[PDB]
Design a protein around this ligand. Structure first.
Ligand SMILES: NC(=O)c1ccc[n+]([C@@H]2O[C@H](COP(=O)([O-])OP(=O)(O)OC[C@H]3O[C@@H](n4cnc5c(N)ncnc54)[C@H](O)[C@@H]3O)[C@@H](O)[C@H]2O)c1
Ligand SMILES: Nc1ncnc2c1ncn2[C@@H]1O[C@H](COP(=O)(O)OP(=O)(O)OP(=O)(O)O)[C@@H](O)[C@H]1O
Ligand SMILES: C/C1=C/C(=O)O[C@@H]2C[C@@H](CC[C@H](C)/C=C/C=C/CC1)O[C@@](O)([C@@H]1CSC(=O)N1)C2
Ligand SMILES: [Ca+2]
Lengths: 413, 358
């Protein structure tokens, strides 16, 4: 049909395939031997390669640089990143509902219909939520129909904006499309459709970009210094002092005072002055882009101790118990709260099992304390007292033999 | 004309004269809701006053109180006039730049010293044993660091810091002794248990083996006599206490243990120098004094390192003062005399002169 592709091929399978074939031929012409080699290894070992690409960032900097799987990751990512689309395109793929924190079956595979009750439950669960996505996946340019593989009852229909890296390629008989997820998903709408005799949920999804430095702390640090150098300057006398008193403070007295309900149980002029000065220090230069930050948190933040048998996430029951307790919930820190632009593990918190991966909207109160030399090493972002975080999703991964959790969360104030 | 060396710690100040082989004075780094009281003199009262430690985790956090510590050092401990002596000060690794500046300002504007210098503690330690290349494990009362050093240069990006040291070990020993059936809870009792820790604790080569032995044989039991003749018995607490260094979860901490921070620090260095670091693991500070710590560190790092790696743990008997000793040697080298910041240089450039000379 047309001289220019649409933004969405919809059910036009045949034009979608023909088009992606030409595009695969064209793109093959721009990949070097190593990128082609990476692509070839991907076809042989896609699942493991994709798995590695999802959790890669969470280890010691030195464990990452010495994983041999890092070559395949970087080379494959360069191949994808090279070919950026010049206008939006929509894609289709199936997900498990567990992916969006719906930890039951929408329906069994043998069932043909979805209850209105499962539908409303699902809508309530996935509504008003940014779900972080990572790693390589194969997507389709057309809506699956009679005769395509349909592994789950959940079909995602995703609009990818202009400049999304996309790698069309051929594997045996098939034309495939590879992307590296590096964004959050908003589900704008769900509808129940029917394909080949069975009801499916179709999620209309769009994308929210955030700066996510992951293990590239150097890039992260450059970025932060570059945006918060002036911040050092525009601070007043007390602010600079109270913040440094917090910084090489001090946070322990302030934060216990906050946690205790001090201001409204046992007022203190000196500390109440201090809380409000720091808050005003964080309103000074609000976060100038959507930003992912990482916090390795202590079990106490989630009502556990290091000896609680519920903190043994190697037993699947305790993961489930944790999800039921926190997943979907909002969570409030009466204290000021410390995070990093980096995702890597560190000596000071090498054994903490719970990682908060927090979405910070542009203009949120907060500061890159690490532009201030001297405690600029934690690559630290300080978030305001009383901050609330919606926990969208809980994932688990293996660090050696220890299971740890990643809490996909969002700053909602 | 004789330079002073003041090694300021979280728990103790070690002070003396460059050229001496030991500090002349070692005293508590404390100041007493009626004010100026310092060291053993800060026990003028633990009543109307309570004790304050101006130095926390190796970092100066109260400047008014630190000035009192230094006043006490010059006038009461060493009995010298600060105006008449160049003064070498020590600082923690990764000490904030603003801190070094503030130390410089105080020594010139408050104490009117003719010259001074700020030296990194771990570098002085390494230097005491005649080395210029090595990785230092420095563990005192407040903080422990791993500081890799190549040809006289600390490598800051590879420095590891654990806020767990002697005072946490003392508190843990109070707790598990209390769990044994004794009662150690007061500040005076904390001092008694520091003394027990210092006399009776050791690091087990194999912790789980030593634990089984304990519950069986009783040849690991030792006795200790309290100030009023009550004699008490200590068993597996002897090695459970400093085991905390290798297993900080004992104290409810989720950081790497001391062997793992040493390995992490080495892995952050250029591959080409790692052999030099493994072959030159130097220990300093009071909390490295435990019998068996060197052997245990050897075994743990062996487990982590490539099987071909030559590993050596150097633990001098004078470990506890090696920072001080290193400062005494440094301050008296002819090639160091250039490095002193004079009062004139401070008058010309400001406090920020420390960065371009220290
Ligand atoms: N990955 C990180 O966690 C991270 C990132 C950047 C900076 N930092 C820095 O680490 C230093 C201290 O460590 P920290 O901030 O991770 O620990 P912290 O001082 O925030 O917390 C200490 C203990 O209190 C608990 N806690 C904190 N808030 C709580 C609440 N609302 N309810 C119940 N328990 C609570 C924690 O679980 C932990 O056990 C700070 O100087 C900070 O700037 C840490
Ligand atoms: N023989 C010993 N065995 C075990 N621990 C000891 C021994 N001697 C001293 N200590 C401990 O070492 C600590 C003091 O050592 P040091 O003077 O190196 O620390 P500091 O410089 O005051 O503190 P930091 O270096 O942490 O700032 C105290 O906690 C003390 O109990
Ligand atoms: C010989 C000696 C060594 C020493 O290192 O004391 C230092 C200094 C001391 C200051 C507080 C007390 C009451 C006044 C003490 C005078 C002390 C000289 C004591 O507080 C420590 O004890 C702490 C507490 S318990 C521990 O493990 N660190 C370390
Ligand atoms: Ca020290």
């Amino acid at each position: 049909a047309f001289i220019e592709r649409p933004e969405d091929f919809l059910k036009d399978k045949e034009n979608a395939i023909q088009w992606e074939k030409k595009e695969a031929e064209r793109v093959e012409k721009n990949l070097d031997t190593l990128e082609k080699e990476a692509l070839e290894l991907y076809k042989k070992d896609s699942e493991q390669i994709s798995n590695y690409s999802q959790t890669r960032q969470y280890f010691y900097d030195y464990q990452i640089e010495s994983n041999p799987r890092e070559k395949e990751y970087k080379n494959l990512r360069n191949a994808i990143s090279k070919n950026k689309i010049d206008k939006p395109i929509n894609v289709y793929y199936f997900e498990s509902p567990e992916k969006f924190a719906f930890n039951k079956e929408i329906r069994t595979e043998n069932q043909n219909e979805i209850s209105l009750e499962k539908f409303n439950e699902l809508k309530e669960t996935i509504q008003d939520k940014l779900f972080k996505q990572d790693g390589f996946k194969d997507v389709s340019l057309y809506e699956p129909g009679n005769g395509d593989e349909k592994p789950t009852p959940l079909l995602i229909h995703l609009k990818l904006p202009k400049n999304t890296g996309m790698l069309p390629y051929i594997n045996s008989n098939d034309v495939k499309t590879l992307i590296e997820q590096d964004y959050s998903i908003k589900i704008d709408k769900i509808v129940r459709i029917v394909i080949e005799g069975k009801q499916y949920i179709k999620a209309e999804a769009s994308i929210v970009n955030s700066l996510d430095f992951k293990d590239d702390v150097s890039k992260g640090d450059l970025w932060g210094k570059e945006n918060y150098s002036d911040w050092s300057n525009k601070l007043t006398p007390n602010e600079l002092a109270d913040v440094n008193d917090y910084m090489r403070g001090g946070y322990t007295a302030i934060n216990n005072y906050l946690i205790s309900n001090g201001p409204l149980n046992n007022p203190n002029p000196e500390l109440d002055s201090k809380v409000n000065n720091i808050e005003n220090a964080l309103k000074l230069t609000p976060i100038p882009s959507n930003l992912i930050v990482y916090r390795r948190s202590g079990p106490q933040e989630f009502g556990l101790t290091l000896t609680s048998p519920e903190y043994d996430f190697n037993k699947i029951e305790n993961i489930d118990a944790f999800k039921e307790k926190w997943e979907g919930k909002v969570i409030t820190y009466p204290n000021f709260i410390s995070t990093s632009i980096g995702s890597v593990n560190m000596s000071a918190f090498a054994k903490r099992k719970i990682i908060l991966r927090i979405n910070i909207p542009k203009d949120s109160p907060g500061a890159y304390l690490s532009a201030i030399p001297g405690y600029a090493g934690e690559y630290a972002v300080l978030l305001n007292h009383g901050s609330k975080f919606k926990i969208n999703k809980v994932d688990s991964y293996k660090d050696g033999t220890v299971t740890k959790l990643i809490l996909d969360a969002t700053l909602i104030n | 004309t004789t330079a002073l060396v003041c090694d300021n710690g979280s728990g103790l100040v070690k002070a003396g004269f460059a050229g001496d082989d030991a500090p002349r004075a070692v005293f508590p780094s404390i100041v007493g809701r009626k004010d100026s009281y310092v060291g053993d003199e800060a026990q003028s009262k633990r009543g109307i006053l309570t004790l304050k430690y101006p130095i926390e985790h190796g970092i100066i956090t109260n400047w008014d109180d630190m000035e009192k510590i230094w006043h006490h050092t010059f006038y009461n401990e060493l009995r010298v006039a600060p105006e008449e002596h160049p003064t070498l000060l020590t600082e923690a690794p990764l000490n904030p730049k603003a801190n070094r500046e503030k130390m410089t300002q105080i020594m010139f504007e408050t104490f009117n010293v003719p010259a001074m210098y700020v030296a990194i503690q771990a570098v002085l330690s390494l230097y005491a044993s005649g080395r210029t290349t090595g990785i230092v494990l420095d563990s005192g009362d407040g903080v422990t660091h791993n500081v890799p050093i190549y040809e006289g240069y600390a490598l800051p990006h590879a420095i590891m810091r654990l806020d767990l040291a002697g005072r946490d070990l003392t508190d843990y020993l109070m707790k598990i002794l209390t769990e044994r059936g004794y009662s150690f809870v007061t500040t005076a009792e904390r001092e008694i248990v520091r003394d027990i820790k210092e006399k009776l604790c050791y690091v087990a080569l194999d912790f789980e083996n030593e634990m089984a032995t304990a519950a069986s044989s009783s040849s690991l039991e030792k006795s200790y006599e309290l100030p009023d003749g009550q004699v008490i018995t200590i068993g597996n607490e002897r090695f459970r206490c400093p085991e905390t260094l290798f297993q900080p979860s004992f104290i409810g901490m989720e950081s790497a243990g001391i062997h793992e921070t040493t390995y992490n620090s080495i892995m952050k260095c250029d591959i080409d120098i790692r052999k030099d670091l493994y072959a030159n693991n130097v220990m300093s500070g009071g909390t490295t004094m435990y019998p068996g710590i060197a052997d245990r560190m050897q075994k743990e790092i062996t487990a982590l390192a490539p099987s071909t790696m030559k590993i050596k743990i150097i633990a001098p008997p004078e470990r506890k003062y090696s920072v001080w000793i290193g400062g005494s040697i440094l301050a008296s080298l002819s090639t160091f005399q250039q490095m002193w910041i004079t009062k004139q240089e401070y008058d010309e450039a400001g406090p920020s002169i420390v960065h371009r000379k220290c």
